[PDB]
């Protein structure tokens, strides 16, 4: 009720023993009443790491997209090793979304090992289940072997109608994924544990399909982008390997449907000046000159007749003596070129000022035998050359032509494919202009450049014309146990790419959301432009390039930081060597670096001196020391995880306030969220994502579904909370419902359409579907839809929500009116009360927890102790939790090695992982998520609670309670204990606790029993007894 405290555990297990006397009664009662329940004490397990690999083939659907909807691929298993290292090799294959599916290694939902189907942004099939939302779904198939080796499984996807299908060993499965959102781009994904070998079959060139695709679905190998080569890569990675060693990489520039759709400028609405007709035909005449030039350069020749294919020139005169068809043919496109110029901002009019007279018009090949042709080039480029502004104008003009052509091709219906299937309207060059290779770009802009030369020869007067994006930034900082408050240190940062790369020293309590340098807790230097950053931008040094190493020495004796670039001290504008001065001792400083989107660096802290380049150039004789040099193990580092997470409300927040009031009369106990600085300067207003901390879990199965009757209240199953919207708050900005632990959407232009709901349909294999089941990661409704007011609304809406632990029927109630919408979820959903709001008034939200007609309070739902009490209550554990954009997370000291390579046109690409890696995971029961156990090295409160939990475990089985010790062995396994013994990154208190727990639950009674007998020396008469002598014979 009050929360997780160590002092409560001390109070509990003061009953463990007294003066060295065990109390079996209290020991068994505490064991039986805490250890089977398991909602309070955190639990720890051993798992093995997983890795997800994708092909770089991103295909999606939107309004007018240039992509095809249907695609098909296969995976064939070479070999699996089941139950490797005491855990089954998890292996799922399916489809995943670039925008939303981030499979960060280590931790996550459930007990970690998050694969394809452990989220609503990806759907997979491991052989027997269609995994989605961390939930397995058994399905009947002809062969149920869970991807045994030498088995080939196909998977196809349709975007025009949302559909995902699998064909295990050629035989299709009886399940189909459908009704999923179509946002972003979908790619194949294979999630695997170690000790596995698979092959990615893409058909056609890269590999060959074992089974031909069903009609409609196309091979994925043809969807490869023109400038991209088919490469297997980790999906969302923050670390790679290079020449020097581990290379830290930042985020990546990802595509979507927005850049796959073209949006051109309409040029048919442009008025025609006289200059239109001024140049419309002189451009056409030079165009005819290029026509003669092209037929000369080709195998064609001179002729009077109207057939270029037979070595004939239709015009047969220098000036085109062209009929109505071809005259209009050149007329309209010359005009349209002028229309695009005017629309996009190029000026119009060609005042040559004797430049036409200067124009030679004498570059004639003279191959013509008669009056045909005789069109000479006028040396437009030689007389007047292009300028870079005009060349970029050429690029965007050809882009506009590409986009209008793509627009009409899409309107009639065309698809992108690397093979140009004309009868299928397939073409590899219909995607927007920002994606075609350099050949198409040059071939579509070179004639435009020649047209620009013609304009220059004509003397043309043409003149050339809240989301902080935490996803694009990543902060990497050494662990807070390595802080230095004295000494002189030095750590290198090597640059692989040139981007927004920041490097320096930061206070250990730096905020992950705000970027480096903006806060006073970061003395950082951005080497993209050389500028340093303590409380703002400051010009300094010089911008760097690829291959440059920055030295970043700090000395706390002189309270300064000095940066070196390639062994030479960077110099400030004023000429000062030190970038920052007058630094207080503070709490210490830590090596930190920020990487922009698509940046690669090498943060060499200085573990090995020979690897540490340029240290002798600057630092060996200067008295500075390599940061973390003598430490044998590599330094653990923490990266800013971009996955948003709910955290408890901070009372230190200067913008939001929560007031908790209990004992209210004619009112349930309430928590009011208000804006501390509404309508003031520098006030942040964004989407506020609330969530009450405690979960609500359904019963195991759905066996049976106003001064109320006490027995009916005791028999009820439903619960009801009410959120109250204040005057001045827009009901259209309020969303009330139910969040699963898997909710990680932080977008501030929130729409109910953006939520992820997906349905799974399992039926007869021959085509009679019977079972369908829908799920969603969220269950809000749109408050504007509910109010239907259609303008300040002073009325207070109590938009309350119902939930019954049986039959999953969730109905709503707005301003005392039953709701026409309902939701249905399977048992054991573990939902959370939630409300989303856009602050528009001083008073914003009031959570209200109480009872209603035939209604059991939500407090009685979330707390088992008061399940019979109808009185509403607000114990300190329940609280408002707000979403936070980013949070720190540990990077494991070792990552899974994967070897991926292609073998042949038939075999294709193969993925192999052999070395197994095991991680200990600490699972928080309420949030249904696990962190790495080593992550507690900076989470000191959870460290305190887990150390005291180990103390509880030791002393419930202390003093020879072998029954309870056996009961403990389920919680704490033998292999678990062995790994906690062997590892070195375990914190101090946890290490001592686990060692003493092993001794207590396995060796304490036996050791005591032997110790009580070592006092005596009862010795019998044996031939071994006559063997002992005082001095052994040397």
């Amino acid at each position: 009720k009050h929360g997780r405290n160590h002092k409560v555990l001390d109070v509990l297990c003061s009953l463990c023993v007294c003066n060295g006397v065990a109390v079996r009664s209290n020991q068994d009662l505490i064991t039986e009443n805490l250890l089977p329940g398991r909602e309070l004490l955190l639990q720890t397990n051993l798992i093995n790491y997983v890795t997800s690999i994708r092909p770089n083939i991103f295909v999606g659907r939107a309004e007018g997209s240039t992509q095809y909807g249907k695609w098909y691929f296969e995976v064939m298993v070479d070999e699996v090793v089941p139950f490797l290292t005491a855990q089954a090799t998890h292996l799922r294959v399916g489809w995943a979304l670039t925008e939303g599916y981030s499979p960060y290694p280590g931790g996550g939902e459930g007990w970690g090992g998050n694969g394809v189907g452990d989220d609503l942004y990806s759907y997979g099939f491991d052989g027997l289940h269609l995994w989605t939302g961390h939930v397995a779904r058994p399905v009947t198939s002809p062969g149920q072997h869970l991807l045994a080796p030498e088995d080939v499984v196909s998977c196809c996807l349709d975007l025009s109608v949302p559909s995902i299908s699998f064909r295990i060993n050629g035989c299709p499965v009886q399940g189909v994924f459908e009704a999923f959102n179509l946002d972003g781009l979908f790619f194949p994904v294979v999630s695997f544990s170690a000790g596995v070998k698979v092959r990615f079959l893409l058909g056609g060139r890269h590999g060959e399909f074992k089974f031909l695709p069903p009609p409609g679905y196309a091979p994925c190998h043809e969807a490869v982008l023109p400038r991209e080569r088919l490469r297997l890569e980790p999906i969302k990675e923050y670390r790679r390997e290079g020449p020097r060693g581990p290379h830290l990489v930042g985020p990546s520039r990802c595509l979507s449907h927005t850049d796959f759709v073209p949006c051109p400028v309409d040029t048919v609405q442009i008025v025609l000046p006289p200059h239109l007709e001024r140049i419309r035909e002189k451009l056409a005449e030079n165009i005819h000159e290029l026509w003669a030039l092209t037929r000369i350069e080709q195998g064609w020749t001179y002729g009077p007749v109207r057939d270029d294919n037979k070595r004939l020139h239709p015009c047969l005169v220098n000036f085109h003596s062209l009929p109505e068809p071809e005259r209009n043919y050149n007329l309209q496109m010359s005009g349209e070129t002028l229309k695009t110029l005017l629309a996009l901002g190029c000026h119009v009019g060609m005042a040559d000022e004797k430049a036409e007279d200067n124009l030679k018009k004498t570059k004639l090949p003279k191959t013509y035998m008669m009056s045909n042709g005789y069109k000479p080039a006028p040396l437009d480029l030689s007389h007047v050359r292009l300028t870079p502004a005009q060349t970029t104008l050429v690029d965007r003009l050809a882009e506009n032509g590409h986009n209008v052509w793509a627009r009409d091709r899409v309107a009639q219906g065309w698809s992108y494919s690397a093979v140009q299937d004309i009868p299928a309207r397939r073409n590899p060059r219909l995607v927007p202009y920002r994606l075609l290779d350099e050949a198409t770009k040059r071939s579509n802009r070179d004639s435009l450049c020649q047209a620009v030369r013609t304009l220059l020869g004509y003397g043309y007067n043409i003149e050339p014309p809240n989301q902080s994006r935490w996803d694009r930034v990543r902060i990497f900082r050494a662990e807070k146990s390595y802080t230095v408050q004295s000494g002189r240190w030095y750590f290198e940062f090597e640059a692989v790419t040139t981007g927004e790369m920041r490097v320096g020293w930061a206070r250990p309590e730096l905020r992950p959301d705000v970027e480096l340098g903006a806060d006073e807790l970061a003395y950082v230097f951005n080497g993209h432009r050389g500028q340093r950053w303590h409380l703002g931008s400051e010009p300094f040094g010089r911008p760097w390039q690829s291959g440059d190493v920055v030295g970043c020495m700090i000395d706390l004796t002189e309270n300064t930081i000095i940066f070196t670039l390639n062994g030479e001290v960077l110099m400030s504008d004023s000429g000062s060597e030190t970038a920052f001065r007058e630094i207080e001792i503070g709490d210490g400083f830590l090596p930190v670096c920020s990487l922009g989107p698509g940046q690669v660096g090498h943060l060499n802290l200085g573990q090995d001196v020979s690897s540490l380049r340029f240290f002798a150039i600057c630092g060996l004789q200067e008295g500075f020391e390599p940061f973390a040099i003598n430490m044998q193990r590599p330094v653990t580092t923490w990266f800013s995880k971009s996955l948003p997470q709910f955290e408890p409300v901070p009372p230190e927040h200067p913008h939001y306030e929560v007031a908790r009031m209990d004992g209210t009369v004619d009112t349930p106990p309430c928590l009011r969220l208000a804006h501390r600085t509404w309508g003031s300067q520098n006030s942040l207003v964004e989407m506020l994502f609330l969530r009450l901390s405690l979960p609500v879990q359904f019963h195991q199965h759905f066996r049976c579904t106003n001064r109320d009757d006490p027995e009916i209240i005791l028999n009820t199953t439903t619960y009801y909370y009410s959120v109250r919207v204040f005057a001045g708050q827009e009901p259209s900005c309020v969303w009330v419902g139910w969040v699963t632990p898997d909710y990680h959407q932080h977008d501030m232009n929130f729409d109910l359409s953006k939520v992820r709901a997906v349905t799974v349909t399992m039926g007869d294999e021959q085509g009679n579907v019977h079972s369908s089941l829908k799920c969603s990661n969220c269950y809000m409704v749109w408050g504007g839809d509910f109010v239907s007011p259609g303008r300040i609304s002073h009325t207070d809406l109590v938009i309350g929500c119902l939930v019954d632990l049986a039959t999953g029927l969730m109905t709503f109630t707005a301003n005392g009116k039953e709701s026409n919408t309902f939701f249905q979820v399977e048992p054991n959903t573990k939902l959370f009360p939630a409300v989303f709001v856009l602050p528009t008034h001083q008073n914003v939200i009031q959570f209200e927890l109480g009872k209603q007609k035939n209604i059991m309070p939500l407090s009685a739902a979330m707390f088992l102790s008061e399940r019979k009490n109808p009185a509403p209550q607000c114990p300190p554990r329940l609280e408002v939790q707000m979403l936070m954009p980013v949070s720190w997370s540990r990077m494991p000291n070792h990552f899974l090695q994967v070897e991926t390579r292609r073998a042949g046109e038939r075999l294709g690409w193969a993925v192999q992982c052999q070395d197994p890696l095991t991680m200990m995971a600490l699972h928080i029961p309420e949030e249904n998520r696990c962190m790495d156990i080593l992550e507690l090295s900076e989470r000191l409160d959870l460290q305190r609670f887990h150390s005291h939990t180990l103390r509880l475990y030791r002393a419930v089985c202390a003093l020879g309670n072998n029954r309870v010790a056996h009961a403990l062995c389920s919680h704490v396994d033998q292999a678990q204990l062995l790994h906690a013994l062997e590892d070195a990154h375990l914190p101090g208190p946890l290490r001592a606790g686990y060692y003493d727990l092993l001794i207590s639950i396995h060796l304490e009674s036996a050791c005591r029993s032997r110790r009580s007998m070592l006092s005596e020396y009862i010795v019998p008469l044996t031939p071994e007894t006559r063997a002992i002598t005082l001095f052994p014979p040397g």
């Epitope: 026509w291 270029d308 068809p325 071809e326 043919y329 496109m333 579509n444």
Partner: nanobody, 126 residues
Framework: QVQLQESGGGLMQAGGSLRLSCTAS????????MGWYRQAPGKQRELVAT???????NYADSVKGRFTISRDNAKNTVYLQMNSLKPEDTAVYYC?????????????????????WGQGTQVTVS
């Protein structure tokens, strides 16, 4: 877009006089050249006759066949008077519209890219 109807011909015996009237309407653009294409059995799209504004027949492939293509720009409806029905004429026909007359392209590849193919109908020779 330009979404023209391809029709004309059908089942016929050898040497069958067929008027393949491919109808085009609802199109302001790509009214210059109105080409005819043909998929022979196991063959690519072979152009047969590309009429042009002013009723100008194009001769690039299969000039020998008496295609006799004609069109008026008033209604943009083309009609192909094909009598010669060779065995390889047992095949399918297509009707494309574009504003680049065949045998005349001094701009580049996008101008050729502007074209609007047809539905596709069988003309069978027996």
């Amino acid at each position: 877009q330009v979404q023209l109807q391809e029709s004309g011909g059908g089942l016929m015996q050898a040497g069958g006089s067929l008027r393949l009237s491919c109808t085009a309407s609802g199109s302001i653009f790509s009214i210059n050249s109105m080409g005819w294409y043909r998929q022979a059995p196991g063959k690519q799209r072979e152009l047969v006759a590309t009429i042009t504004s002013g009723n100008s027949i194009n001769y690039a492939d299969s000039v020998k066949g008496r295609f006799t293509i004609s069109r008026d720009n008033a209604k943009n409806t083309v009609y192909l008077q094909m009598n010669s029905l060779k065995p390889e004429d047992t095949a399918v026909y297509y009707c494309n519209a574009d504003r680049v007359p065949n045998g005349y392209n001094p701009w580049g590849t996008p101008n050729d890219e502007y074209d609007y193919w047809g539905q596709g109908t069988q003309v069978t020779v027996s």
